[model samples]
Target: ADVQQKLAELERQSGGRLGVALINTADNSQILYRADERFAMCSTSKVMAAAAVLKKSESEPNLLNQRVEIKKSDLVNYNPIAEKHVNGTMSLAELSAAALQYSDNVAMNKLIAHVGGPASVTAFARQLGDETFRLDRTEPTLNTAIPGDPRDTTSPRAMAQTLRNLTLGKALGDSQRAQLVTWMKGNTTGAASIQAGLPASWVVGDKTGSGGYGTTNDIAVIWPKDRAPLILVTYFTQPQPKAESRRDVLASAAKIVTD
Candidate 1:
């Protein structure tokens, strides 16, 4: 009851709708916290993109860390595609860092190419049982394109399901799952999103999603002290300024649950 009222107030203050899903990460338990509960995976899809790499190179996911060559054309995506951020040719490890750090589209695309291309992400998505979570690698479905066309996309509700299931060790072994968690914790972009509301020192493993004026997202495995980690998923769309506002929205949602 308290949480619901706080959310209602948040929406009123923001003059925009907000939707959230809180999950018990311990066992992926779930409960919805807003309207239009269905969420597009948005940038959150990369969480699985990284996991797919682990799935393919079960021999050693970190193997992607080794150096690789980059073509001149590939530079467009990672560097400044449209007055965008400057990036460099990075290994899968560096790509993961870039994707999490600044949400660099080019770096992610490079990693997508190395992880046997986006197709590998889809093939591995099927293995996770959430087949829809994998969007077309070349079709430009939603969010920015990685190794292929920009049409790739997925739903938010299912993405949350993927996280919960992943937590349950459905995608990788418990050890690998832990590794994935460790890697995700490195995400530094959109700090004002979902983790905004929790305790300042709270440890949150999450990924934030954003596209020019069309999308906003933050999905995370939040590990607060004592109570098992919780899954906090937030998605926003329909003509907003982008980054800062979405970050505020995510933070608003977190504060409701925490305060």
Candidate 2:
């Protein structure tokens, strides 16, 4: 109850609405605040795209080594890694790493294509038993964070649960799951959010997203020494004009939850 109260106060102080979900994988205990509200997924969906590719690879085996062609026209904005390989070929393994570790837009789109499309990712989530998670559009377009819009959005609880299944549950093969965690740990984008609030000794692997309308999100699997791993998801949104710095709000939220 006190945690919820502090979270509520944090929301008010930050001038943004927050949706949080914290789950202890060991005990299944949870702390939720607005966990059901939909928030724009932005690049965070890249993790789902990567997961879908890995899931498909479980049966195909050879899919990861397959080379995928990259065209200049297929490239989209914010594709730092993909642009370097334009008009070239990248193996599925490399593309997955680019998408997750670098949040490369072109890599994400290519992976989405390889997995069949945005709907396929949603279907993959459904297969994992996450009913509230949806990915309706591809990158750049999906980052259009219109307030109150439901498209390409996910509930914090649903995302947290999905992460739990991927990281701790039986949704993925051991090596495959470890690969995903390794990629998330190498993420170049989450320096200021959840990672900033935690102790340096603790280990955290996370995916982050940013969009218009003050939308910022981070979902993480954290390991604290001498304790069970915890899954935490925080999604924040406010009006564009009144948007507070996402770095501060997310870090503060993390502090509030783990303190």
Candidate 3:
């Protein structure tokens, strides 16, 4: 009850642009605030692309180790790790790490293309029982000044469910799950959002995304000592002009669920 109240108050503060979904795996208690509203997914769509690679690997054992050359031109905007390697080749496994751990657009695009395209990714998500998620465009599309057009989109509820599925081993097998979780745990971006809000003793494995027009998100699995893990998904669309305000909402979100 306390958590629910805090979450509701926070949602009201966002002027109808904040969405959250928190589920405690221990008790199955869920707290939601406009969790079904579809919003631009930003870089969070990389996980689906990564899952596509693993899903394909189930039939083609060599899929994981296949190498692809990443051209400098392909490594366009919003890249942190892929830009450094410019025109180098990396195996699908390594590229998945870059996509998840660093939100590398170049690596993400390469992997999506490797799996066929954005359609193949959405197809695989449906195969995994994720019906509402879609990665209709590439990463660079987020920069094109369109508020929500040309952007990958999903709802907070869907994102949380996908994360829970990934954690529960529903989306990938044992080997693939380990790879995905390890990469997510190693994520170094969006530290000011959920990561900054977490208590020092908690462990949060997450994917953070940022885009034009105040779109930011953090979808994470929070582990409190000696307790079952909780999945927390927070999204900000058309957020306040100040980045700090968006981050403070995330901090409050983390506190509401974990406290």
Candidate 4:
């Protein structure tokens, strides 16, 4: 209850709604605030895309090694990495790394295309027994984040649950789970969010997202020195157009719960 109050205070101060979920896989204790509310997924969906690709690879042995041609037209704005490789080919492993590690837009789209489409990702989530996670569009279109629009959105609890399943549950094989965790651990974009809240010595692997209406999000698997891993998902949003994202709010929320 104290954690909930603190999170509510943080939300009031930031002029945004905050949704958070903290699960201690050790004991299954949880701290959730507005955790069931949907928020824009933004680039964070790439993690799910990466996980879907990894799951598919388990059945199709050669899926990861398959090279995907990158056409000039496939390039999307903000695709810093994919743009450099246009008119060439990238293996699915490289694409997954680009998407999960760097939040590369083109890599995400290509991975989605490779996996069959946005629905395939949703199907993968369902396979995990998650009913609230959904992906309705691809890349830039998904980031539109229209208020109350459910497309490309996920609840904080659902996000945390999915991460828990993939990272520590039975969603992926041992090697596959390790691969996903490695990609998230190397993520270059979450420094200001949940990662910022914890001690440097604590191990954290996370994926971040940003979009219109001040949306900023991070989903992480944290290994604090002697305890079980914790799954934390934080999603923030303000209802104004082009609102500035408050990564600090996420950081503060993490502190409130973990401290």
Candidate 5:
């Protein structure tokens, strides 16, 4: 396909370390532009976390549109959001928006705790047919990195499926689904990767996953609104020297796909 060829060319041109997988949600077609190797998911892991939240809320059923607060004390990172708004409180929807749209680390950390900690996510992933979505390496576990993140680890394949589930209304209740999609639409990071490769003004709803130095990813149901759109998942690992480098490669690859 022209898309795959362009991606291949972009990777060849970037000369920067990169990895990618583009799939069709309609029929499961895939065009792998690089070595099909596994990579860590940085903030993109938030999608898994969001799914975990969905599962936990379902158990309660009445936990819909629940109001939660964001506080300076609840600040997730040690940065400004944490420093200034430590005790500031926002609604559950707001927090979720901040988590996915802005990729707010603090909001994510809070959601993890709110959804009954890491164990809750474990149960959710298992229920969602994701056996490989692990947060941390444990007993009998294989993958291990610097400790303490608590919310770590994921695969591109699993993430892509998760997004499909959202699209199919299999992830959350209608109301929750609406809110979640709004949040995903609000996502502003890695735009050059998922939404980048499509025609201008096309409807591309996606969630990008990235972590510090170890992972980068984009998963989506890309519909140009006019032309048939497929799922695009671009993951970069050690090949990307820094965040900007990885994003640049992703954006460029996307450009090749679009233009």
Candidate 6:
């Protein structure tokens, strides 16, 4: 089978819906496997919100340092870093670090509110020229993860391009891009996905998203030691009884792309 068929077969092995996009920057070769599908974005939408805040900060400058108070009610569950900031205040930079590094949902919501909510981020995505992507909800909310929901979702191609934009300095300024890249390199999530699947010598900066049940996805910048890095994104979903299969699918997909 060709790479596309192999990816489709890999998804079938998961007994789930899947989409994939791989871009080898060295030759500008791109493969979109089941690229038309929309995957549940889950927490990955936070990256879009962070990008919006970063772009806005380039003009205002002070927005990056402006402090926002986090009330106890804002400390939604499923995030440890957000809980630490409860009843406290943090700068936009700090919040973005939490959002990217830890996938803190509350921090993501706070950033969304700081940027003027879902519509603002949605417009931000449009400004970046993502056709099928939309941002419409905050974290800890089920709206973003429901399968087939148009809002707060992105295609594998759009997500891979978003990360490519981050790596290629397309939409964000140097400082903003550097900070986001640093946070993603240190990301603690997706341990079972692409990060674990890639060669240890290759550096991968990636974001992961997962639903309450069986949706798992990852988008990443994979850097080789002596060659141009690549972007790879994968998503999988199905009503099922297992959790590890999705990660295995992601791992296998990354191996296939890089090898």
Over the stretch 35-119, how does candidate 6's per-residue lDDT look in tens digits? 7777777777778888899989989968978998887787775667778877788888888888888888777888899889988
lDDT of 4 at 167: 89
Candidate 2 lDDT at 200 equals 79
Tell me, by lDDT, which candidate is best. 4
List the global CA lDDT of all models. 0.64, 0.87, 0.78, 0.90, 0.59, 0.79
lDDT of 3 by residue, 1-259 (tens): 7777788888787663777888889988888877888777777788888878987887898887998887777867777877777777888988898888888888899888998888888888888898888777776784232344634777888888888888754678888777777778888875777877778777778887776666778888887789898888887766443333366677778777777
TM-score list, all predictions = 0.77, 0.96, 0.91, 0.98, 0.77, 0.94
Residue 32, candidate 3: how far off, in angstroms?
Answer: 0.7
- Tell me the TM-score of model 6: 0.94
What clash count goes with each model? 11, 0, 0, 0, 21, 0
The pairs that clash in candidate 3 are none
Query: What tens digits encode model 5's per-residue C-alpha lDDT throughout 122-209?
Result: 6677777766566642111211222233345555566556666665447766766666666676667746666765666877666775
Which candidate tops TM-score? 4
Question: In candidate 5, which residue ranges exceed 4 Å CA deviation?
Answer: 1-9, 12-17, 33-36, 61-84, 137-151, 227-229, 239-244, 255-259
Ranking by lDDT: 4, 2, 6, 3, 1, 5
Residue pair clashes in candidate 2: none
Tens digits of per-residue lDDT for model 1, 107-208 = 566566666777777777778887555554521334542222234555445666778777545677776677678777877775778877778888888888
Least accurate stretch of 10 residues (summed lDDT) in model 5?
Answer: 138-147
- Cα lDDT of model 2 by residue, 192-247, tens digit: 88988888788888888888877888889899989999899988888883464486
Stretches off by above 4 angstroms in model 3 are 142-151, 239-245
Instruction: Name the 10 consecutive residues with the lowest summed lDDT in model 6.
Output: 142-151
Taking all chains together, the TM-score of candidate 5 against the true structure is: 0.77
Which parts of model 2 have CA positions greater than 4 angstroms off?
Answer: 241-245
Backbone clash total, candidate 1 = 11
